[PDB]
């Protein structure tokens, strides 16, 4: 709700927590030491 969003801006809370797990995301091919591996993501979180 827009009033709960002001409880996020006024107290300086960051919404970046992590990747979602509800969606059935693989999450295991998403991260590899090789940054150019096809199928992998680079960000280790984000507000979801």
């Amino acid at each position: 709700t827009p009033e709960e969003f002001w409880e996020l801006l006024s107290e300086g809370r960051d919404a970046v927590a992590g990747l979602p797990t509800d969606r059935g995301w693989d999450l295991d091919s998403l991260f590899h030491p090789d940054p150019t591996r096809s199928g992998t993501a680079h960000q280790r979180g984000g507000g979801f």
């Binding site: 709700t1 009033e3 509800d22 969606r23 059935g24």
Partner: protein
């Protein structure tokens, strides 16, 4: 009940034969809605305000711009609909 209408308002200071039309709906078609204005020894505006509540709750489409046509009432932010959410996910 056969005329497409299913609700009736027993307008009176006391609702005589209240369950009689409920008896009509119990034994024929669908159960009808018995809304009444007042009650024996109950004529306060709280009772009529309660009469409005049972009318709305029983399906009567009360005009709410007429109950509040003027009473010194202003819009107030209120919580929205509590969407009863269930997990509906489609996986590739």
């Amino acid at each position: 009940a056969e005329q497409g209408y299913r609700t009736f308002l027993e307008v009176s200071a006391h609702p005589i034969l209240t369950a009689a039309i409920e008896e009509i709906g119990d034994g024929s078609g669908a159960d009808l809605s018995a809304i009444h204005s007042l009650r024996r020894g109950d004529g306060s505006l709280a009772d009529f305000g309660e009469a409005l509540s049972r009318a709305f709750a029983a399906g009567v489409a009360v005009d709410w711009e007429s109950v509040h046509l003027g009473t010194g009432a202003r819009r107030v932010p209120l919580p929205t609909y509590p969407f009863q959410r269930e997990r509906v996910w489609l996986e590739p």
